[PDB]
Every structure is written in C-alpha cells, then in structure tokens.
Symmetry: C5
Subunit: 307 residues, 5 copies
Amino acid sequence: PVDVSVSIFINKIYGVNTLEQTYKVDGYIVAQWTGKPRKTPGDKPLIVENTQIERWINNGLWVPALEFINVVGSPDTGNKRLMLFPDGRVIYNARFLGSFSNDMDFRLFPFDRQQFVLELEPFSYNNQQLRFSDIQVYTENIDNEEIDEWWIRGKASTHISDIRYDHLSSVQPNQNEFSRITVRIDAVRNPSYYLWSFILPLGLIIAASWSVFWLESFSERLQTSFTLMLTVVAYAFYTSNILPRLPYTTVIDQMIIAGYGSIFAAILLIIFAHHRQANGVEDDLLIQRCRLAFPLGFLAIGCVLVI
Amino acid sequence: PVDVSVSIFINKIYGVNTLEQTYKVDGYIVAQWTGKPRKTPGDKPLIVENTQIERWINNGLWVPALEFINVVGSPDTGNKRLMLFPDGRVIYNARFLGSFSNDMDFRLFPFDRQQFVLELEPFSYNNQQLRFSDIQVYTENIDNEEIDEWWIRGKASTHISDIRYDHLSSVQPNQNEFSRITVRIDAVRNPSYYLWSFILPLGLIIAASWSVFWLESFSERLQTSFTLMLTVVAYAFYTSNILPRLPYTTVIDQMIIAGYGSIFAAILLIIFAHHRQANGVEDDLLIQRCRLAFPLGFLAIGCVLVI
Amino acid sequence: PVDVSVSIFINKIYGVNTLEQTYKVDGYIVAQWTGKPRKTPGDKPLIVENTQIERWINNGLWVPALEFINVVGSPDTGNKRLMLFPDGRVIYNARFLGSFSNDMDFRLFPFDRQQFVLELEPFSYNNQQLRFSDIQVYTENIDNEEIDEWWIRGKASTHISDIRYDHLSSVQPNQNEFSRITVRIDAVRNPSYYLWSFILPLGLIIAASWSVFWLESFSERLQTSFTLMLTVVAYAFYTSNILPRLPYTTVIDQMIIAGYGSIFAAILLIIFAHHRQANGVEDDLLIQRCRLAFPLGFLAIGCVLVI
Amino acid sequence: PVDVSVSIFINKIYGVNTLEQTYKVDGYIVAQWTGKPRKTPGDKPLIVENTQIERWINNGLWVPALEFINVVGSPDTGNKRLMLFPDGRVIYNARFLGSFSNDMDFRLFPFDRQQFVLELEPFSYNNQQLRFSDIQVYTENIDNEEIDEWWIRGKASTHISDIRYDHLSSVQPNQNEFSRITVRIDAVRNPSYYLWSFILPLGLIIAASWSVFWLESFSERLQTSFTLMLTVVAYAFYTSNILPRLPYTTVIDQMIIAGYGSIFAAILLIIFAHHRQANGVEDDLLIQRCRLAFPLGFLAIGCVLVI
Amino acid sequence: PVDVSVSIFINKIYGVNTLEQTYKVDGYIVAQWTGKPRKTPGDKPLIVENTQIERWINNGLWVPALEFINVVGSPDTGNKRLMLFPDGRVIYNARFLGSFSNDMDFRLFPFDRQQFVLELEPFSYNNQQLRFSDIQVYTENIDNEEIDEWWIRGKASTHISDIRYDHLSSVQPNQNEFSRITVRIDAVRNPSYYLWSFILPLGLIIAASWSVFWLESFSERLQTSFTLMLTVVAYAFYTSNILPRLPYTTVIDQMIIAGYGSIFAAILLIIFAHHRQANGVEDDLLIQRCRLAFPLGFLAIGCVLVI
Ligand SMILES: [Ba+2]
Ligand SMILES: [Ba+2]
Ligand SMILES: [Ba+2]
Ligand SMILES: [Ba+2]
Ligand SMILES: [Ba+2]
Ligand SMILES: [Ba+2]
Ligand SMILES: [Ba+2]
Ligand SMILES: [Ba+2]
Ligand SMILES: [Ba+2]
Ligand SMILES: [Ba+2]
Ligand SMILES: [Ba+2]
Ligand SMILES: [Ba+2]
C-alpha cells in the first residue's frame, strides 16, 4: 500500500448550471508519494515539465492516474509537472479547470444553501492509499461579499474513506476497496439582487392588485382586473427569462402563482358581489369592504407557507 | 469467435436536446475477453494505464475497437485502463461522456414517456461475440424524485442481437452479422413544474376570459376582449421562451390555441349579439346568458380531446 | 489513374443554422481502391485500427487524403480503420460528424424546400479517379414524419464530375482536373408547428383587428386600435424570438407587416371618417360599413401575394 | 531574400460579431517559393500530405511559418499539403477557417459599409520576401444578392508593404522590416429586412402617435399617450432583442429615442393646453391644431439629422 | 538565479463576462534570458519554429514554463518561436489568446472604472528571476473613442514582486519565493449608449408617471396608474434582457425600483385622497396639488442617493 499525500488549491468556483446540476472549478492538484531513491543531476531535485512526463512514464516511471469521480467530461489540464527528489519522493503538480457534478436543491432558490464537492480517487489502484488531504481555499472568502455571487462559509471540509465496489471481476476477496478523498465547500447565495429587483416589485404589484376593491363601478373593477392579470403575466415573463431554469418551482414562482390566484379570486368576488343581489345589482357591503380582509387573508397564507 | 463480457455503469443522464433528439450520458464501460496466457511481473495481474495502452497495441496486443452506434460525434474519453491477467484474460475499463441519439416523441410533452438507449457494437469484427451485458444503474433512481428532472422506472433493460448488413464488400456468404448490445432505460418526466407554473395559470386565464360575458355594455365586452387577446399572446410568449423547442405542437400549445379560439369565438358572439336585432341593437338573452354554456362547451371539447 | 469506390452512410442530419447556411451530418465514409497484392498473416485480410494507420503511412503505405469541399472547419473524426486484403485491395472506413455548407433559400420559410449536399474530392491527387458513389440513407425517411423536423424525399442522389481549376501552378496542360463526388438529399420542412402555433393565431388576431369598425364611439375606435397595435408588436416579438434569424423576410414577417399596415390604414380611415364631415363630426355610412370591405380587401391582397 | 508567391482563395465570409468586431473566413492559402533542386521519384513532383509534412520538417526541410496578424485565437487548419518539384520549387497548400479582427463602424447600421481584411506576414523571418499576392474571391459576388446577407463590391484588393517594428532586440540596423500582405474586401449590408421589418412599422407607429391630437377629451389624450409610451417600449424591446449588440447608438435607436421624445413632448403640450387657460380649462386652438405642425416639425428634424 | 526579460504586446481586449468576472486578451509574449553560448549555422542566430521547439526541448534545451496565474482554462497558443543567438541568449516569442480573471465591481455600471490585469509567474522555478517587464499597448487607446466600448487611460502599469507560498513541501528555508509580473490596465466604460437609450427614456417615463395627478376623476387616476405600472414592468424587461447579468443591483436597477416605488406611493396617495374625507368623497387640495411636491420630492432623494 503506497501512501499518497494530496493537496488541492481552489482558485475559483463559478459557472453554476442549475439544470445540469454542475459547477466549474479551477485550481491546482498536488500528489506526493515516496518511491525508490534516485540519482538526480547534482543533489538537487529534478524538474520534469509537461511533455517530458510522458517520456518518463514510457521508461517505466510509475505515475498513478487519479480520477475525479464527480467530474463531467474531462478536465482542462494546464501546465503539469513532476518533481523527483534523490531520496525517492515524487511530487506531481498540475493545474486544472473542470466541470463537476453534485446533488443540488434549488427549491429555496433566492436563499440557497449549496455545497460544492470534489471527489478524487485512484483509477486503477486498489492498494495505494491516500495518506492525507489538505485543501487551500485561501483565495479570500470574505473580502467583498456583495461582489462575489456566493458567500463561502468556513474553510473547506475533508473526508478520506474507503469505497467498496460490489460488482467486480472474478477475484473478490481482498480488494473491493479504493481510497476516496471527498472535499466539500459550503456556500450560501446572495439574496440582495433577487430581493430588491424581484421580490420587492413583485410585492408592490400584488399589494397594488388589492386596490381594485377601492374602485366604485363594477365595470371599472373588472376591466382593471384584466390589466392586472396582464401585468402579472408580463412580470412572470420578466422573471422567467432572467432567472435560472429549473425542473421545480422556486419561492418566486410560488409568489407568481399567488398573484394569479389572488387576481382570479378577486374576479370571482367582484362578479359574485354584483349578481348576489337584492333585485339584480345589489353589491355586498362587507364584500366591497374586503379591502381589509384580502391583504391580511393573503398575508395569513404568506406567514403560513414558509411555516 | 471471441467471447466478450460487457459491463456498463451509468453515472448520470442529462442535457436532453429536444430538437436534436439527443441526450448526454456519463459512465464507465468494461469489456472482458480471454486471450492467451501471459507472464506478468510476479503472479499478480498487470495494470496498464492511459498512454501505455497504445504502446502495448503497437507491440501487437489485440484491442478490439467498440463503437457506440447511436453516439453523436465522438465521446469524451476519460481515464482508460487495461488489466492483463497471467491466465490470459484481459479487462478494458474506460470512463466516457457522450451525446447519444434515439427517437423521441414529445407530443405529450408535460407528461412524457421517454427511453434512453445505448447501442454498442464492434467496429471491425464480425466474428467476435458479445457474451453478456450487465448494466449497473445503481446510482439511485428513487432517492429524491422531485429533485431530479426525470423519474427512472425499473433497472435498465438488455438485448444482445445479431445485426445483418445487407450492403457490403464482395464477400457475402458467412459474415454479414455483427453482435450488438442494446441498453434501454425507461424514464418519465416530472409534470410538477409545468402543471403549477404553466398549466394552472393558463387555465385561470382561460376561465377568466369567460368572464367577459358578465360585462354590461357591448363596448366593454369588446374592448376587454382585446386586452384578453393581448394577455394570451403575452402568455404564449412566456411559455415559448422557457419551454423546449419542437417541430410539433405539445399539449400546452394546444391549450394556447384553444385560448385564441375561445377569445375569437367570444368576439364573434359579442358582435353577433349586438347586430342580430329587433331594431338594430337588440342583444340576445340566451346569448348573453352563454356565460354557462361557454365554460362547459369548452370543457366538453377539453374532455373530448385527450380522449 | 487509380479507381476509388466510395460508399457513404448517412446516420443523421441536424443542427441547421439558417444564418450561417450550415447543417450537421453524422455518418460513415468508406473508400475502396485496389493496390499491390500483399502477404497478410494467414490468408485473412488485415485489420489496422486508429492509431496504427499512421504508423502504416509512415512506412510508405499510400493513403489519399479525401477532402469535403463544402465542410466548415474540420470534421470530428471518430474511429477509423484500414482493411488490407492479400489480393491488394485496401478499404478505408471512418466515422465522421461535420458541419457542411450549401446555398439555402428560406424566403418561403414555413414551407421550405431545402437540399443537403456533401461534396467529396481528393485533396492532392489529380489523377486518381472516383469509380462510383453509393449512398446509404437507409435510416428510415418515413417512419414517423411528424416527429422528425424534416421530411426526406426520395433516396439521395449522385453525381461524379470533373472539376477544372483554372488558376494553378506553372504546369497546365494535362491536369487541371480532379474528380468530385456530389451527394444531394432533398428535404421539405414540416409546416405543422408553424401553421398552428404561429400562422393561425396571427390570422385570428388580424381578423379580430377588423372588429374595430363595429365600435360605436370614435374614441373607442381609436383607443382600441392602439391596443391592437401593441398586440401586433407583442406578437412580432413572440415570433421573432423563437423563429430562426434571417437576412430576409419570411412569409410570417410579411403577415406581420400586413398587420401593421392594416391597423395603420384602419387608423387613417377612422380619423378620416370623423373629420370628413357635414359640419364637423359627420361619420361616413359606407366607411363605417367598411367592416365588409376591409376583410376581403385584405384577402384580395392575400390571394394576390402568393400569386 | 527568398521570393514567396501567395495565393488566397476565399470560400465564405460569415459569423460577423459586432461587439467583438470579428468575422469568420473560410478558404485556402497557397505559398510558393523556389528552393534547391531535388530528386523526386520519377521526374514527377512529390506530394507530401498532412502528417508527413512534420516528418519532412524534422529532416531539415525548410517551411516558414506564416502568421495571420489580425486573426483571433488560432485558425482551424484543415488538410495541408506540400508539393516538391525536382527543379526546386515548393508549394504549400492549406485549408483554413479562422476568426479575424478589423475596425468596424456600425453607426450607420441598417446601411453599412464594412470591409473585411486579412493580414498575412512571416512570423520569424525578416528577409524572406512576399513576391506577389493573388486573391481568388471567385465564389460569385452577384448571383443571388437578396439571399446573401452582404453584397460584395468589386474583386478584392491587395497591398504588399514593409512593416517596421521599432521595439526590438539588441541588433537594429538592417532588419526592422517584415513583408506584409494585406487583403481587403469591401462589402455593403442588405437594408431590406431592416427597412421592412423594422424601419417601416416603427414609422407607422410614430405617425400613429401623432393621432393623439385628434382626440376630443383631455383625459382621452393623456390616457392614450401612456398606451403609446408602452407601445414604444415594447417596440424598443422587440428591436433590441433581435438587433446586434453595440457600444453605440444606431439609426434605429435614434428613431426610438425620437419616439420617446415625441410622445413626452406630446404629453407636455397636452397638459399645457389644459392648464394654460382663460379660466382654468381653456384649450388652445392652434395647439390642439398642432396635428399639422407636429408631423412636419418632426420631419424637419428628420430631414436635418442625416444632413 | 537566471535573469528573464519579459515583453508583452497587447493587441485586443474584449469579451468581458460580468457574471464570471472574466475578459479576453489577445497579444504576444516575449521572454529573453541569456544561456550558454552556442554555435549556430553561420554566425547568424537560429530560428526554431513551432513543432521543432519540442524537439529541441527533448534534446535537453531548457525552456521554463511561464504560467498566467489569473488565466481561466488554458490559452489558445498561436505560432511560437525560439531564437537562439551564438552568444547564448535565447528569445521565446509566442502569440496567445486567453480568458483572464480579476475582481470586478459593476455597482456603478453605466459609469464603470474597471482594470484589466495579467499575472505572469514561472511555474516550476523559484530561483529564476524576472529582470524587467515592458508592455506595448501601442494599439491606439485614443483614435476613435466612441467606437471602442472601453476607453483606456494611460499606458499600462507594471509591478515585479516576490510572492511567498506558505504551504509547501518539506523544505522551507530558502525558497518560498517566486517572481511575479503584474500588468494592470485602467479603463472606463462609455456611458453614451446607456445614457441615451436607457437612462433618458427611463427618466421621461418616470416624469410622465407624475402626470397622473393632473387627472380629474379618481377612476382615471387609478386606472391610469395601473397602465403606468405595466409600462415600468415592460421597461424593466427591455433593460434586463439587453443589460449584462449581475449578482447585484446597478444604478439603472435602482432607478427602476424608484419607478415602482413612485407609482405605488402615487397609488397610496390617490386612494388616501379619496377616502380621507369630509363626508366620504372629499379630495385633499394640497394632495391633488402634490404635482409640484412629488417631482422634487423624488429629485431630493435622487440628489441624495449618489451623495
Ligand atoms: Ba489540454
Ligand atoms: Ba479526450
Ligand atoms: Ba430516426
Ligand atoms: Ba442521485
Ligand atoms: Ba478525435
Ligand atoms: Ba434570449
Ligand atoms: Ba487541426
Ligand atoms: Ba455562392
Ligand atoms: Ba533525437
Ligand atoms: Ba498549438
Ligand atoms: Ba477575489
Ligand atoms: Ba488596430
């Protein structure tokens, strides 16, 4: 069992794809294991850069292939390097940019708790062992929070476990097990933009739609309600175009639905008030006075929902 | 005829392209056939990783090229590996991400039954035989259903058949036939988002468009109907922008068309009511009382259509 | 002059880009020419797969480079293979996906007659001759027509010609001429989606815009006409966003323009009716009765245009 | 100083990016210089195709690297070829597709005069000389003009100059100078689509906005003006979505601004007419009669602007 | 410690991605260090072009890998060249296009002060020293300012520093330190397009929304206010579609919010005026006369905000 020390440097996280549940990571990966002592030019360690590494591999140098389990496609590998010390240790350093996968729940969307994971694991080697994992996130989490889209909470996280693959080749007994490094980074979305540019005017619009009951004539009350409907549709459009695509409804979508339902309910009451009648036209006092009931009645449901 | 055992591990299915009828698959492929016994270092099997495999092929090692028939372009091949046992068996393991093709009917779109297929088959070898196919979909179908976009039903499916190519080279008689592995996975789309964020408010809008008959003045009835038309167009826009592009109409599109037709019909009746007349202005009782007939008359067609 | 037999298998055609006049083709290409007899292992023909082909070329094996003339960029070349028979024939088989160019007229757009062309021709060799071209389109043209976006008419088409390049190097006399294979596939667009989801509601909207003349008050007639204008703009938007981008106007765009012109004309008549007058207000009978003339007067132009 | 004859064949120009000031070119490049006589197989010139060229370079064959100065990124290089004549001449032929840069002024946008430039120049060689440049644009400029987006005027253009680089290595005196080929192609945009589908209905809308003064009641005049404002915004949207993105205003944008300004001015006059008054309500005759002044007053500015 | 002289030529800066905080740079990089004297053919320096450089590296020629620290992915490397002088100096010249990262604050967006940075640094070598950095931005900053999107202020900027990496391998004492070149270019966005096509009509719209108080009837005042709301939503859409996506609100977004708030406030006052009353209907003089207060009251906040 060969001991391998992994260090991962995270430069940037970006390009979140909500539909594909995918996010981009750029950084460095460093792997250090101790092999057989060697004779370098002078005593000083040897530096082997990109194209030459292959040449060394062809001469029988041993370089385990480490795979990102949760990666999508194949990473963009930048400059890579081998460092060979005379005392036998070997240090592989490479730069990568890759698209990674993980389970992501956006149902809370404006206010989101997401976590970005990297899963590393040897491709072909069951007994080679990951000694320890060190993650340098040092690119500052809090410098400007309201600039960066996501606010990163705490410094990384680490797990080194043994994954067992049940379905395998003819020889079971001693190796189903591969060592896996899991690095998770917790992050929270910045609600500002969505609160001010979406939630707020949406609220204003809903509240304003309640003002239909302060109209005098029935005709006015109806004809206006249609304009309201149109406004909600237009808003639904404005949101849907900018907002990220999802298989499910977010909080904002629910607000929109609440808008539609509020207006349709208003329509029903407005028509009901007219044709529930003394002779044919009598309009209900308390009902036309629902201008108080409707806003809080909505607010009741509003306070009930997140709860 | 060489026996080849194939195992395919499906990690993720995503990136469905409705227009191109294409979907992305990420996973592993494992091929195992038994060759001539060999002498490995020690007794233990030999592990040959990525770049080295080519070197082994150049030395006369035999590695059949397996082709995905239904793939689009060429797959993104990750880490690949050969495992050479002294008793002669050879196991090829590779990681891939690829875009695959298949016939897809979206006419039911909000509620969709689709099936994702992989078609494997040797490129150049007519007699080499696929022994058996095993598909590990083990990445959990039901864990969170309402998170994942598609709900996968059952565990995979398998067929191993012999495909005959009629048009071929000068020598017909014994080999037109190649062994083909076909893996199909049945899946059903999650209607939630579309029901709540599309179907529902669309319904509310249609129903509301029926309220035009509860207006008193002819002018009101018309002028309002135009606002309704506008609203339906705006909605058609909001849907069309978000929804996937298709060569054909879905259920929702039909609903939209139903909206247009309902409103235009309403216009016709509204004008007809005015100018079918006692003197010139007489409005038809039963017709202005169509407020009952129109909703169910639509509903009749609605219940007739899916039927 | 070397005789070369080409067979092309078309798997899929897709990704039409209207602006770039480009379309994607995936399939196989097979080239067969007869060289000098060879000694294979056993008698059986030799199979040389991807990476090895280059190695054979470096040993002086002759492999003409065939170029797609109308290709854009360079194709995605999948698995490729050489088959070497002892009697001297050589068969090159490769899989490709590529973007191809051709002249495309979309002026009829909803109903389109387009043709997809492949142009093959030796890169460096003036005397090497393409014996015959065979195109297997066998992937079924008619299975489900209303699923596939394009309906393919007939089985392919073929031409083998000699192209002469006037401008050339210092030596003219005997070779300006290269053999070119041209494969054309005629296809017709499926109008369904565009008829129902675009043409139809657009028509309904136009017809409805004629109902403005059934209004009583001048004010109503005007104020409504503006809402109509807005509706046409909104519709123009909804179409333009979904529909493919073009340098020219399609049929639908013309319909839109017809809408604008109809409404503006309506405005002119509505204002004219008011201020062409007995004293100042007199409205013209026949003119307010143009509710008959306008629809057919439009229809006249409509029946005149395609004609 | 080595004489090099360059011939460039332009197949297609497309993919204009207004923001990046970039355009795509596909074609062939041919370079011919005369080296030392050689012994070919037979007397006939030698054909060296793609992969082999490198092999020849490694044997000390001399192949100058020609760089496109104005290219963006690196070109997609298709099939390439060397032709070696026994009398010593060498002809390099390659196919390329590349994104090129040039200064582009879109301020006139609907009617545009643009020019597409290619700048070629040896990478490392100060004394090697470009003998002459020949550009075959022969792909027909005028066949169908209203199909192609751009109308190409005249056949190419050519310049061969000497560029001097001031800032250089330690040795100045005799070589700051590299030979540069510049190929420019003048082209004019097709205004049709923009005239009919944009300019025209925009005009109709503006003209129609002048009809607000033919309304009787002040309320009507205002309430309608708002609908007009909305219509102009909607139109601004429809244009902005389809039209290419720019750092500056085009002609159409100016028209839009003119729309806004016209309507706001109308608002100001409408309110002014009401509250500039005999008692409080008196409306100005000449002002309500500005229905004549406003259209030409706008037209005055319109005829003044391009002038 | 090897002295390395770097010169960087900036051709173009473009493709700013606001969300990813990324921008494209195209140009040349030149690195000059003095090695061991060599014997060239003749006395004249040797020119080694693209593919050959690798061959020289394989023979033990030393070519430090320089990394762009702030690059995203890996650059598109064009033609590259080595120049070997007999006196031992070596000059590496390469052309590159790459996407680079940097902190970008768009909160001021229409008027933006941004700075484009390049960070260069040896990949594997702690003692090799960057002698000096020279940046040729010579592509003209001021030629046409209103054409180019960004106005570049001053000629570049330069820093050469020593970066210390705390976390490292087992040997600390003398080398934590790598030499880093930092090149920063200050630029300011061109407000024209946004002022005229966005800020201005937005202002006109706001001002116009104040005209609601000049209406007589309460009904008019309300029903109109809704149309205003719709107009602001439509405008919010038109802006949001064209404008760049951000995690935060810009100035324009704030203006939009101000619009919504202004209209909602107007609604509140309009309803309050009606139902704060003598009997039930009395409308407040000063309140209906707020037509003066509202515009400046807004303007007060407007002048307070940037301040
Ligand atoms: Ba790479
Ligand atoms: Ba790959
Ligand atoms: Ba099919
Ligand atoms: Ba899962
Ligand atoms: Ba490939
Ligand atoms: Ba879009
Ligand atoms: Ba290439
Ligand atoms: Ba042509
Ligand atoms: Ba050598
Ligand atoms: Ba390169
Ligand atoms: Ba930062
Ligand atoms: Ba320039």
